[PDB]
Tab-separated table of C-alpha atoms in Angstrom:
chain	number	residue	atom	x	y	z
A	567	UNK	CA	31.927	-23.866	5.238
A	568	UNK	CA	28.749	-24.055	7.438
A	569	UNK	CA	25.101	-24.835	6.930
A	570	UNK	CA	22.450	-22.330	8.068
A	571	UNK	CA	18.692	-22.234	7.520
A	572	UNK	CA	16.173	-19.375	7.525
A	573	UNK	CA	12.654	-19.137	9.074
A	574	UNK	CA	11.133	-20.925	5.987
A	575	UNK	CA	13.581	-23.842	6.580
A	576	UNK	CA	15.679	-23.219	3.435
A	577	UNK	CA	19.214	-24.462	3.895
A	578	UNK	CA	22.182	-22.390	2.607
A	579	UNK	CA	25.844	-23.169	2.314
A	580	UNK	CA	27.274	-20.353	4.544
A	581	UNK	CA	30.461	-18.738	3.396
A	582	UNK	CA	31.796	-15.136	3.477
A	583	UNK	CA	30.105	-14.802	0.028
A	584	UNK	CA	26.646	-16.362	0.786
A	585	UNK	CA	26.501	-14.414	4.043
A	586	UNK	CA	26.812	-11.152	2.106
A	587	UNK	CA	24.374	-11.892	-0.718
A	588	UNK	CA	21.845	-14.129	1.090
A	589	UNK	CA	21.913	-16.792	-1.757
A	590	UNK	CA	23.934	-19.860	-2.395
A	591	UNK	CA	27.624	-19.031	-3.052
A	592	UNK	CA	27.395	-20.058	-6.654
A	593	UNK	CA	27.479	-17.556	-9.525
A	594	UNK	CA	26.991	-17.625	-13.323
A	595	UNK	CA	29.710	-15.223	-14.515
A	596	UNK	CA	29.195	-12.716	-17.350
A	597	UNK	CA	29.505	-14.580	-20.777
A	598	UNK	CA	29.260	-13.059	-24.197
A	599	UNK	CA	26.965	-14.333	-25.553
A	600	UNK	CA	25.238	-16.665	-22.979
A	601	UNK	CA	24.454	-14.006	-20.302
A	602	UNK	CA	23.707	-11.070	-22.783
A	603	UNK	CA	20.145	-12.557	-22.939
A	604	UNK	CA	17.822	-10.706	-20.428
A	605	UNK	CA	15.775	-14.003	-20.369
A	606	UNK	CA	18.679	-16.131	-19.034
A	607	UNK	CA	19.724	-13.395	-16.569
A	608	UNK	CA	16.115	-13.253	-15.276
A	609	UNK	CA	15.690	-17.117	-15.229
A	610	UNK	CA	18.888	-17.538	-13.137
A	611	UNK	CA	17.994	-14.627	-10.779
A	612	UNK	CA	14.396	-16.150	-10.389
A	613	UNK	CA	16.145	-19.682	-9.727
A	614	UNK	CA	17.827	-17.873	-6.747
A	615	UNK	CA	21.356	-17.485	-8.088
A	616	UNK	CA	23.734	-14.553	-8.832
A	617	UNK	CA	24.325	-13.809	-12.544
A	618	UNK	CA	26.099	-11.007	-14.439
A	619	UNK	CA	24.493	-9.471	-17.495
A	620	UNK	CA	27.350	-9.403	-20.084
A	621	UNK	CA	28.104	-5.859	-21.358
A	622	UNK	CA	30.090	-7.644	-24.231
A	623	UNK	CA	26.806	-8.202	-26.038
A	624	UNK	CA	25.892	-4.437	-25.941
A	625	UNK	CA	27.290	-1.426	-27.871
A	626	UNK	CA	25.526	1.571	-26.277
A	627	UNK	CA	23.854	2.788	-23.033
A	628	UNK	CA	20.488	2.636	-24.868
A	629	UNK	CA	20.894	-1.064	-25.902
A	630	UNK	CA	22.114	-2.085	-22.416
A	631	UNK	CA	19.366	0.034	-20.716
A	632	UNK	CA	16.710	-1.878	-22.723
A	633	UNK	CA	18.276	-5.180	-21.693
A	634	UNK	CA	18.407	-4.076	-18.032
A	635	UNK	CA	14.741	-2.930	-18.155
A	636	UNK	CA	13.855	-6.320	-19.596
A	637	UNK	CA	15.701	-8.172	-16.801
A	638	UNK	CA	13.931	-5.848	-14.164
A	639	UNK	CA	10.469	-6.523	-15.823
A	640	UNK	CA	11.045	-10.415	-15.503
A	641	UNK	CA	12.521	-10.674	-12.064
A	642	UNK	CA	10.541	-10.650	-8.771
A	643	UNK	CA	10.524	-7.552	-6.510
A	644	UNK	CA	13.528	-7.603	-4.162
A	645	UNK	CA	15.730	-9.734	-6.750
A	646	UNK	CA	19.089	-8.228	-8.013
A	647	UNK	CA	21.569	-9.068	-10.626
A	648	UNK	CA	25.095	-7.866	-11.650
A	649	UNK	CA	26.738	-6.357	-14.777
A	650	UNK	CA	30.019	-7.647	-16.404
A	651	UNK	CA	31.957	-5.043	-18.279
A	652	UNK	CA	35.329	-5.719	-20.125
A	653	UNK	CA	38.276	-3.623	-19.034
A	654	UNK	CA	40.111	-4.025	-22.480
A	655	UNK	CA	37.027	-2.388	-24.197
A	656	UNK	CA	37.550	1.335	-23.259
A	657	UNK	CA	34.419	2.267	-25.262
A	658	UNK	CA	32.188	-0.220	-23.230
A	659	UNK	CA	33.650	1.366	-19.986
A	660	UNK	CA	33.053	4.861	-21.336
A	661	UNK	CA	29.227	4.392	-21.696
A	662	UNK	CA	29.066	1.478	-19.278
A	663	UNK	CA	30.250	3.082	-15.972
A	664	UNK	CA	28.064	6.279	-16.380
A	665	UNK	CA	25.128	4.089	-17.180
A	666	UNK	CA	25.474	1.949	-14.004
A	667	UNK	CA	26.047	5.247	-11.859
A	668	UNK	CA	22.825	6.670	-13.496
A	669	UNK	CA	20.716	3.466	-13.055
A	670	UNK	CA	21.948	2.958	-9.459
A	671	UNK	CA	21.025	6.715	-8.675
A	672	UNK	CA	17.519	5.798	-9.989
A	673	UNK	CA	17.624	2.738	-7.661
A	674	UNK	CA	17.924	-0.026	-10.214
A	675	UNK	CA	18.508	-3.481	-8.763
A	676	UNK	CA	22.199	-3.790	-9.813
A	677	UNK	CA	23.919	-5.470	-6.813
A	678	UNK	CA	27.506	-5.565	-8.290
A	679	UNK	CA	29.771	-4.887	-11.162
A	680	UNK	CA	32.323	-7.524	-12.400
A	681	UNK	CA	35.199	-6.208	-14.405
A	682	UNK	CA	36.415	-8.952	-16.807
A	683	UNK	CA	39.687	-9.197	-18.808
A	684	UNK	CA	41.838	-6.988	-16.656
A	685	UNK	CA	41.945	-5.348	-13.184
A	686	UNK	CA	41.411	-1.572	-12.951
A	687	UNK	CA	44.083	0.839	-11.464
A	688	UNK	CA	43.623	1.999	-7.813
A	689	UNK	CA	42.223	5.332	-9.054
A	690	UNK	CA	39.606	3.737	-11.390
A	691	UNK	CA	38.709	1.019	-8.810
A	692	UNK	CA	38.213	3.855	-6.167
A	693	UNK	CA	35.830	5.620	-8.670
A	694	UNK	CA	33.830	2.330	-9.131
A	695	UNK	CA	33.734	1.612	-5.302
A	696	UNK	CA	32.762	5.197	-4.241
A	697	UNK	CA	30.539	6.454	-7.074
A	698	UNK	CA	28.489	3.486	-8.516
A	699	UNK	CA	26.376	2.677	-5.406
A	700	UNK	CA	27.237	-1.083	-5.665
A	701	UNK	CA	27.108	-3.673	-2.839
A	702	UNK	CA	30.414	-5.252	-4.104
A	703	UNK	CA	32.913	-5.216	-6.950
A	704	UNK	CA	33.846	-8.319	-8.814
A	705	UNK	CA	37.448	-8.490	-10.102
A	706	UNK	CA	38.864	-11.351	-12.330
A	707	UNK	CA	42.728	-11.358	-11.893
A	708	UNK	CA	44.479	-13.511	-14.586
B	1062	UNK	CA	30.506	-32.199	-17.071
B	1063	UNK	CA	28.241	-30.480	-19.884
B	1064	UNK	CA	26.345	-33.699	-20.831
B	1065	UNK	CA	22.589	-33.148	-20.301
B	1066	UNK	CA	21.013	-30.690	-22.895
B	1067	UNK	CA	18.171	-28.319	-21.722
B	1068	UNK	CA	18.516	-29.085	-17.908
B	1069	UNK	CA	16.752	-25.985	-16.394
B	1070	UNK	CA	19.288	-23.471	-14.868
B	1071	UNK	CA	17.559	-24.006	-11.485
B	1072	UNK	CA	18.143	-27.875	-11.607
B	1073	UNK	CA	21.861	-27.249	-12.447
B	1074	UNK	CA	22.462	-24.560	-9.766
B	1075	UNK	CA	20.236	-26.374	-7.092
B	1076	UNK	CA	21.947	-29.692	-8.046
B	1077	UNK	CA	25.401	-28.084	-7.072
B	1078	UNK	CA	24.105	-26.421	-3.926
B	1079	UNK	CA	22.043	-29.434	-2.794
B	1080	UNK	CA	25.128	-31.628	-3.533
B	1081	UNK	CA	27.260	-29.269	-1.194
B	1082	UNK	CA	24.520	-29.329	1.430
B	1083	UNK	CA	24.308	-33.168	1.444
B	1084	UNK	CA	28.187	-33.418	1.808
B	1085	UNK	CA	28.491	-30.892	4.531
B	1086	UNK	CA	25.493	-32.463	6.347
B	1087	UNK	CA	27.275	-35.900	6.292
B	1088	UNK	CA	30.839	-34.569	7.048
B	1089	UNK	CA	30.044	-31.806	9.731
B	1090	UNK	CA	26.410	-32.228	11.047
B	1091	UNK	CA	26.178	-36.018	11.545
B	1092	UNK	CA	23.441	-36.419	8.668
B	1093	UNK	CA	21.088	-34.429	11.033
B	1094	UNK	CA	19.232	-31.316	9.685
B	1095	UNK	CA	18.189	-30.405	13.388
B	1096	UNK	CA	21.851	-29.428	14.188
B	1097	UNK	CA	21.790	-26.697	11.289
B	1098	UNK	CA	21.473	-23.368	13.221
B	1099	UNK	CA	18.409	-21.235	12.245
B	1100	UNK	CA	18.269	-17.469	11.640
B	1101	UNK	CA	15.080	-15.466	10.628
B	1102	UNK	CA	16.723	-14.355	7.348
B	1103	UNK	CA	20.090	-15.236	5.784
B	1104	UNK	CA	22.121	-12.431	4.175
B	1105	UNK	CA	23.231	-8.787	4.623
B	1106	UNK	CA	26.415	-9.638	6.666
B	1107	UNK	CA	29.413	-7.568	5.404
B	1108	UNK	CA	32.525	-9.813	5.205
B	1109	UNK	CA	34.363	-7.333	7.662
B	1122	UNK	CA	18.792	-6.370	27.454
B	1123	UNK	CA	14.965	-5.926	27.420
B	1124	UNK	CA	14.626	-2.179	28.350
B	1125	UNK	CA	17.503	-0.046	27.072
B	1126	UNK	CA	18.134	3.753	26.441
B	1127	UNK	CA	20.836	5.168	24.039
B	1128	UNK	CA	21.913	8.833	23.918
B	1129	UNK	CA	23.551	10.254	20.717
B	1130	UNK	CA	26.315	12.828	21.091
B	1131	UNK	CA	28.408	14.692	18.385
B	1132	UNK	CA	31.184	11.946	18.798
B	1133	UNK	CA	28.813	8.933	18.689
B	1134	UNK	CA	30.126	6.301	16.203
B	1135	UNK	CA	27.453	5.593	13.479
B	1136	UNK	CA	28.307	1.835	13.004
B	1137	UNK	CA	28.324	1.235	16.816
B	1138	UNK	CA	25.113	3.279	17.216
B	1139	UNK	CA	23.219	1.077	14.515
B	1140	UNK	CA	24.652	-2.199	15.943
B	1141	UNK	CA	23.303	-1.180	19.405
B	1142	UNK	CA	19.827	-0.233	17.893
B	1143	UNK	CA	19.865	-3.429	15.711
B	1144	UNK	CA	20.451	-5.729	18.721
B	1145	UNK	CA	22.182	-9.162	18.453
B	1146	UNK	CA	19.225	-11.432	17.231
B	1147	UNK	CA	18.452	-11.577	13.444
B	1148	UNK	CA	14.831	-10.199	13.263
B	1149	UNK	CA	12.926	-7.214	11.760
B	1150	UNK	CA	14.811	-4.786	14.013
B	1151	UNK	CA	18.254	-6.122	12.899
B	1152	UNK	CA	17.172	-5.605	9.269
B	1153	UNK	CA	15.624	-2.217	10.053
B	1154	UNK	CA	18.897	-0.827	11.460
B	1155	UNK	CA	21.574	-2.726	9.432
B	1156	UNK	CA	20.071	-3.175	5.793
B	1157	UNK	CA	21.856	-0.377	3.765
B	1158	UNK	CA	18.960	-0.650	1.223
B	1159	UNK	CA	15.209	-1.284	1.163
B	1160	UNK	CA	13.000	-2.177	-1.819
B	1161	UNK	CA	10.338	0.255	-3.377
B	1162	UNK	CA	8.623	-2.012	-5.941
B	1163	UNK	CA	11.825	-3.353	-7.812
B	1164	UNK	CA	14.012	-0.401	-6.958
B	1165	UNK	CA	16.692	-0.488	-4.134
B	1166	UNK	CA	16.869	2.840	-2.230
B	1167	UNK	CA	18.814	3.951	0.893
B	1168	UNK	CA	17.298	2.468	4.156
B	1169	UNK	CA	15.138	5.401	5.482
B	1170	UNK	CA	15.117	3.955	9.082
B	1171	UNK	CA	18.951	4.447	9.069
B	1172	UNK	CA	18.516	7.996	7.698
B	1173	UNK	CA	15.931	8.935	10.467
B	1174	UNK	CA	17.978	7.298	13.355
B	1175	UNK	CA	21.295	8.765	12.038
B	1176	UNK	CA	22.730	9.846	15.478
B	1177	UNK	CA	23.210	13.570	16.463
B	1178	UNK	CA	23.281	15.436	19.767
B	1179	UNK	CA	19.867	15.456	21.644
B	1180	UNK	CA	18.561	12.101	20.166
B	1181	UNK	CA	17.420	9.557	22.875
B	1182	UNK	CA	16.407	6.076	21.681
B	1183	UNK	CA	14.446	3.886	24.170
B	1184	UNK	CA	14.153	0.260	23.262
B	1185	UNK	CA	11.305	-1.573	25.107
B	1186	UNK	CA	10.754	-5.459	25.030
B	1187	UNK	CA	14.100	-5.729	23.148
B	1188	UNK	CA	14.229	-9.510	23.772
B	1189	UNK	CA	10.796	-10.299	22.280
B	1190	UNK	CA	10.878	-9.184	18.536
B	1191	UNK	CA	7.038	-9.319	18.143
B	1192	UNK	CA	6.626	-6.697	20.924
B	1193	UNK	CA	9.897	-4.670	20.562
B	1194	UNK	CA	9.230	-0.888	20.204
B	1195	UNK	CA	12.057	1.586	19.331
B	1196	UNK	CA	11.130	5.100	20.316
B	1197	UNK	CA	13.214	8.119	19.235
B	1198	UNK	CA	12.817	11.198	21.333
B	1199	UNK	CA	14.403	14.602	20.451
B	1200	UNK	CA	14.193	18.126	21.904
B	1201	UNK	CA	11.031	19.975	20.598
B	1202	UNK	CA	10.698	23.612	21.824
B	1203	UNK	CA	13.096	22.901	24.816
């Protein structure tokens, strides 16, 4: 681990992670229900930390779209956030992955996707890496 | 460790980061903030000469081309050529500077004042009617 500072004199812990995202290497993972709230996702993003919006709190693309739009309205221009989807909830994936693809194609500030509660197959992971327009992919091996 | 109710998320996350900074500063930088290296901006790093001229060919490597145009120093020109995305209000779109300077046969990029960021000029020249 290293220290680095920017022009403004802000010090960062410098790791492989912090060097990618330009923020402290500290994240609030997706939690149903704690990070389903757009207000908490926005507060943490505005604090300068990476947080996953929990898909576990959402049942359709429309409901998750309204939550994402609420986060985007409350975060500063140039801020980003991630989405946590649950791999053992095939229904969530079925509306969740097309939604992220579509919002990323519209340029929504979704930096990454974390898949909780299972690791996708090589074929599925390839689809997520190549099609979703994400900076990185979060995996949570058990 | 969950003891203090209604601590702002900023105080919790900052408290952890500032704790790490303090401990690294003591252990690895002799309690001296002046030994911390500075960069213009921190981020955008994938985990994997004053006057110059670059000529694109059919076989020119895209990553090597953009590294060369970017330069070594972290400044506006590094961001211009290596950021995959730029911001349009709150949206994140593909870096248009990378699209425009995508290398192809006939493209000639002259960098002038490459060492002084404030004065650097990157000039793309292409064949126009011969």
